[PDB]
Amino acid sequence: SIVGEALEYVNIGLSHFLALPLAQRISLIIIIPFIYNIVWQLLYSLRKDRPPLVFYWIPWVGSAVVYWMKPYEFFEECQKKYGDIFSFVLLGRVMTVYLGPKGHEFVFNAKLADVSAEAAYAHLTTPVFGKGVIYDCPNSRLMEQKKFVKGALTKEAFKSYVPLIAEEVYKYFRDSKNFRLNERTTGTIDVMVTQPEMTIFTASRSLLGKEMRAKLDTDFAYLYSDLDKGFTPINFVFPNLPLEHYRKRDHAQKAISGTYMSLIKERRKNNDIQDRDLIDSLMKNSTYKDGVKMTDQEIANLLIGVLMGGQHTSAATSAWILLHLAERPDVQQELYEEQMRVLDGGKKELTYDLLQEMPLLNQTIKETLRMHHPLHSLFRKVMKDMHVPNTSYVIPAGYHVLVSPGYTHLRDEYFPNAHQFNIHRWNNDSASSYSVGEEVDYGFGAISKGVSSPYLPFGGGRHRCIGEHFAYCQLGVLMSIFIRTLKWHYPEGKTVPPPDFTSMVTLPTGPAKIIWEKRNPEQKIGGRHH
Numbered sequence: 296s297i298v299g300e301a302l303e304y305v306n307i308g309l310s311h312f313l314a315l316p317l318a319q320r321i322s323l324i325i326i327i328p329f330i331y332n333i334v335w336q337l338l339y340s341l342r343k344d345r346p347p348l349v350f351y352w353i354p355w356v357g358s359a360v361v362y363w364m365k366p367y368e369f370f371e372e373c374q375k376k377y378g379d380i381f382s383f384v385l386l387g388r389v390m391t392v393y394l395g396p397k398g399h400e401f402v403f404n405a406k407l408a409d410v411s412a413e414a415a416y417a418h419l420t421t422p423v424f425g426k427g428v429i430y431d432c433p434n435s436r437l438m439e440q441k442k443f444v445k446g447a448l449t450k451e452a453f454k455s456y457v458p459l460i461a462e463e464v465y466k467y468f469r470d471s472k473n474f475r476l477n478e479r480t481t482g483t484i485d486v487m488v489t490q491p492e493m494t495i496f497t498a499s500r501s502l503l504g505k506e507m508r509a510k511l512d513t514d515f516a517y518l519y520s521d522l523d524k525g526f527t528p529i530n531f532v533f534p535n536l537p538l539e540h541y542r543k544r545d546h547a548q549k550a551i552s553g554t555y556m557s558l559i560k561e562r563r564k565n566n567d568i569q570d571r572d573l574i575d576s577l578m579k580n581s582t583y584k585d586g587v588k589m590t591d592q593e594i595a596n597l598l599i600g601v602l603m604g605g606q607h608t609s610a611a612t613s614a615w616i617l618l619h620l621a622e623r624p625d626v627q628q629e630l631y632e633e634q635m636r637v638l639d640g641g642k643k644e645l646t647y648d649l650l651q652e653m654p655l656l657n658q659t660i661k662e663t664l665r666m667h668h669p670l671h672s673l674f675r676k677v678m679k680d681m682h683v684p685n686t687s688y689v690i691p692a693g694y695h696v697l698v699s700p701g702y703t704h705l706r707d708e709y710f711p712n713a714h715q716f717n718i719h720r721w722n723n724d725s726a727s728s729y730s731v732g733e734e735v736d737y738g739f740g741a742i743s744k745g746v747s748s749p750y751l752p753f754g755g756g757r758h759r760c761i762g763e764h765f766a767y768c769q770l771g772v773l774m775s776i777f778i779r780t781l782k783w784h785y786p787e788g789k790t791v792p793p794p795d796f797t798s799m800v801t802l803p804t805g806p807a808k809i810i811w812e813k814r815n816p817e818q819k820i821g822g823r824h825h
């Protein structure tokens with residue numbers, strides 16, 4: 296017995312390895328991880344306590360490419376091969392997807408100790424919003440921040456925001472080069488140009504107030520653009536490599552929060568603290584229950600976060616509404632009749648209460664949010680091994696879970712002819728959402744306990760959206776005025792564009808152009824302008 300003579304050759308083989316020509320060493324630096332990764336997946340598939348893992352050729356990268364470009368097609372293929380729960384590798388991360396209403400329950404209603412949203416999201420949002428708020432703080436702090444913000448999102452606030460938002464839409468029709476309704480009776484617009492502008496203008500005026508809205512008439516508006524460019528998915532992957540747009544982002548966060556603090560300190564200086572906007576509200580109502588006050592910097596940062604949370608969701612949504620309606624003059628016609636009925640042929644000024652008597656308008660918003668959920672995937676990082684009910688699967692800590700209610704929105708089983716835009720599928724069901732039973736309060740108000748609805752555009756559980764009613768108010772006013780003022784249609788041979796999922800906000804693929812025409816060519820919009 297001389298195995299020892301073989302152990303010598305292990306050592307010998309090792310030294311011959313280190314002496315390979317650089318050409319072959321490089322090749323082996325490639326081939327070894329490639330082979331190991333394939334061997335690893337084969338072994339992994341034998342485990343019974345793990346959901347099926349989607350096969351991938353390139354290590355670390357995983358299924359990133361296909362998930363990035365066409366996530367719903369990716370989900371549908373995986374769902375056919377493996378069923379509703381499956382994992383895939385995404386740039387060094389393992390993502391476990393749970394499709395359908397049971398998936399909604401598993402992720403949105405997960406125990407606070409099981410999963411973390413801030414662990415998934417903070418590296419992307421913290422540099423944009425600033426420190427101390429949203430995901431740069433314990434969940435209990437987030438809960439109270441949401442409570443604070445909801446305090447300026449009351450029915451009473453919406454009654455005051457509606458004429459403010461309407462003024463901004465009319466000003467945009469009057470003054471924007473995309474319209475100029477006093478000078479032109481027809482024109483062509485790119486809805487991915489107009490809607491972000493209309494969105495920030497209307498949200499600024501109502502949530503931040505007249506001063507902050509005035510700032511957007513200046514070069515200052517470009518900081519918002521800069522801040523926005525630091526909010527892309529490459530910041531998800533590489534949170535900070537010293538790139539140009541990273542620093543413009545940091546600069547913008549400091550400059551914009553600086554402007555908000557300036558106004559906050561000015562208002563406190565003059566005791567000019569009213570009930571006009573979210574700034575007034577947070578100045579009066581931002582003390583945590585342990586008695587610690589939000590700093591002025593944190594208040595400013597939270598303002599940025601709130602405006603940002605409403606910016607891309609709403610802008611994408613009003614863009615899709617215009618795009619679906621552009622090939623549906625029958626739906627424009629039907630919405631126009633409702634406007635004439637509810638507002639007495641235009642004789643009534645639009646109010647928040649009359650908005651609630653516009654079911655078809657609200658069903659249009661509801662249906663667009665069904666077909667175009669602006670966030671195709673929501674994430675949590677798994678913090679404790681999770682057992683998946685009625686399976687033998689365990690999702691270990693360190694994995695991520697991914698939930699996609701927008702995918703379920705597009706399934707025939709839950710919405711017949713799911714790829715058909717039909718506002719009447721919501722007849723006698725025009726509410727933005729509603730708790731279909733028992734409620735629960737995580738610290739920012741009573742919300743639905745069950746999150747099993749196949750329709751979940753605002754998510755659910757502790758991380759549930761609080762901007763839903765603001766969004767309906769904003770989109771409601773905006774679409775009410777579009778409908779009463781304009782008709783619109785596609786250029787010849789154009790139709791509803793397919794979604795672009797790469798910004799991870801489900802935008803229409805540009806350029807998404809429509810042609811508008813004034814319903815009343817001679818109608819003038821009053822007020823002064825240069």
Ligand code: HEM
Nearest residue numbers: 601604605608609673752753754758759760761762765766
């Ligand atoms: C069409 C409009 C909107 C849609 C579809 C939408 C969607 C969502 C969704 C799906 C979530 C949950 C994310 C998750 O669970 O990971 C969420 C959370 C949230 N959104 Fe919205 N949103 C919209 C508008 C707004 C507006 C207008 C605001 C502010 C005025 C806002 C602020 C927030 C906030 C503060 C959260 C809580 C985040 C958390 O607790 O982690 N959103 N939104």
